[PDB]
């Protein structure tokens, strides 16, 4: 907002020497190299996108955590059902899990459930993979995972 | 502002020293013939009076 007038003639003034208040060295004055809006994204090579994905899956699987489920007694969007299904599935909740599935009803279940994060098939991303301790994905979802890489 | 100007900010120590003789001195008083009040020498006083 500041003007642009020169505050002093810079001569016989005894004062320092300045132009406008806009000067950065002027409490309230403009910023120097303050951050301007800009993109942080870029285009990582496609080959690498696939590599990391498979590698991550292979890792969690190597440890012995990639379970390929299919049976879902969870008829509707009710958490109780999933919590019971997971209980007999061997999922006591002592492990974070990336529940990958195509069914939006399975979603509703583990949706609110804290120790599990729901996810669509294509949503497979190394972040959420290495993010969780366990990995459980529908066979049909494994097929679409197989389409991208398999 | 003109010719006469202090060359250096006087040290706090040197400053205090100047005010050495600066200290005050207690006044002098004496008991009067009237009340026990303390009058200054060669003087009358309120709430006491005098003579002659």
């Amino acid at each position: 907002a500041y003007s642009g007038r020169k505050i002093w003639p810079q001569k016989h003034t005894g004062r320092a020497r300045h132009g406008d208040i806009g000067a950065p060295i002027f409490v309230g004055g403009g910023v120097v190299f303050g951050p301007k809006p800009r993109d942080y994204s870029y285009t990582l090579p496609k080959k690498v996108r696939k590599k990391g994905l498979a590698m991550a899956v292979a890792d969690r699987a190597r440890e012995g955590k990639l379970l390929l489920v299919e049976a879902f007694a969870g008829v509707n969007g009710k958490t109780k059902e999933f919590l019971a299904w997971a209980k007999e599935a061997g999922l006591d909740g002592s492990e974070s899990v990336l529940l990958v599935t195509g069914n939006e009803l399975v979603r509703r279940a583990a949706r609110n459930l804290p120790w599990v994060v729901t996810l669509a098939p294509e949503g497979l991303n190394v972040y959420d993979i290495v993010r969780t301790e366990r990995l459980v994905m529908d066979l049909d979802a494994w097929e679409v995972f197989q389409n991208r890489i398999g | 502002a003109k010719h006469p100007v202090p060359k250096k900010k006087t040290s706090k120590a040197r400053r205090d020293a100047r005010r050495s003789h600066h200290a005050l001195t207690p006044p002098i008083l004496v008991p009067c013939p009237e009340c026990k009040a303390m009058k200054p020498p060669h003087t009358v006083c309120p709430e006491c009076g005098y003579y002659a």
């Binding site: - | 200290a23 005050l24 006044p27 008083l29 303390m38």
Partner: protein
Amino acid sequence: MEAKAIARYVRISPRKVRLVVDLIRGKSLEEARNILRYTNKRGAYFVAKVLESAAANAVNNHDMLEDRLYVKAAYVDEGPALKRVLPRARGRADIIKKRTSHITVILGEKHG
């Protein structure tokens, strides 16, 4: 036992009252009273008033006797300052500082 009495926000220079204070520090009550009485200074009035109150507080609130107390200690403190302008030759504007005081007086029981 000791009794305090403070007079904050007193319009007067510290250095000025310090002189008066330094006179009665560690003096008998009655002795000090007479000093302030005939002492030629403005700071006298403000120190005498508060010191007088220090005795009242010492009595009506601390069971101390008027005939046996003195000035255990006392001192003035520099409060804020009322800055004012001042028209000077050729338009110079010098700020003037009408300071304030914080006279403190604490009495105390003598001996036994």
